[PDB]
Amino acid sequence: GPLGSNSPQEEVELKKLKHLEKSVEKIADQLEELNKELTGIQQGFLPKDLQAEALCKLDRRVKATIEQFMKILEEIDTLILPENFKDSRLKRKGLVKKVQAFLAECDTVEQNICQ
């Protein structure tokens, strides 16, 4: 492919990816809030039974976060980017890797609670 041949058509794909990047940031914020809540439950005065109820409510929320990240991946998976759209391809790969790193963090939470 040619050098410095950025095209208007690519801008359309890059805008789609930017909107997905922003949706990922919002989901990530939800993950950080869930992380804070989990710490709070652990450092709180809830007795065993109420602690379990609070961790299982937190579990449903972590399952919701995982699902949102999965829907983002399914959305990114609809993209077909020509080999010449190097910048879009780099952005798509980086975003998928970022989502997969957040999914691994969700998994650490989800498997540590409401067993």
Place this chain on the structure above:
Amino acid sequence: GPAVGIDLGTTYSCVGVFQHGKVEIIANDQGNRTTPSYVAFTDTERLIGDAAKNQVAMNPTNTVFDAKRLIGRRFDDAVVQSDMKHWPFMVVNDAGRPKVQVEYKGETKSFYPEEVSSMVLTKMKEIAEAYLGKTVTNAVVTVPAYFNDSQRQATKDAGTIAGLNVLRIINEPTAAAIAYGLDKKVGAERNVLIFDLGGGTFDVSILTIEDGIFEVKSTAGDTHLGGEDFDNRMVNHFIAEFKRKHKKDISENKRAVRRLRTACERAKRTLSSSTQASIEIDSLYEGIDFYTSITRARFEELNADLFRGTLDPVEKALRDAKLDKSQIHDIVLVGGSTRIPKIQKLLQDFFNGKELNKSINPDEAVAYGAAVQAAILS
């Protein structure tokens, strides 16, 4: 407020209204012309339609679907006993009657199939009201031609629980025939074959129409056959391709299989109007990108047995109706999977190049005909 036509399907439902000399299929709150026949029970609420289907992966045990496979049946019915194995939700026996058992607002609750179906009907009613900006009370609700008295009555009960005045219950193949106006054609008795392949079921019905009297001559089909099976064959094909190219098995990674399956369902739809489809999935498994394509011909080979298999029911229904294939005046395609060119080709070739009735959206034809009948009864 006018009268509506509602197609209550196993996996998807559809509502239509006849206005300004034309039938309007009504889009739901999410803009979809069809709504999942799903009801989900959560700690904080009850979800219906797209909202219920959208959280199925999160809450599989408490999300109900396929109520139509249980409605009006006894618990010991073979269909109830066989179908239970495939559902993530609990089905219990309440004095010979099946009930679906779920966790709802921190409590173990059970519902009769007509109650689950009434919730789906409530959603279809609400969908119509949101579009029309008028109250909707009257409706024509469709049922499969093989439904018995119990199943028909239980469907009517679902309408009544939902606050609907169920004007009439009509068979799904009758609704499909009505949409195409096959009862309005002048001449002798007309033999109509309805080929219905949608929502996970395959139903073939032969009807004879004469002076507006619809006679169901025969019914045949497969209880479990549809788009999910065709997607599965493409998933197998891709999993094998990934093993050949990378010597890695992605089958045990549920997320990798899901991303692949979602892409396959989309590629299959592209294959109904294009001869090739491409898929690009970054970091599918173990950081490996999977960029591939599939031709319509390969998709057809992967599904050869299933596609050819659809003619067995057609042959069975013809033999039960005591009719030669040349005695069939009209053929109607119903259900989303009838959009598959190979399925259309097999059916047209079996009927010696006869043209198929397919101009009406296959997913919408049953609701369309029910909306026509609801207008006539207004």
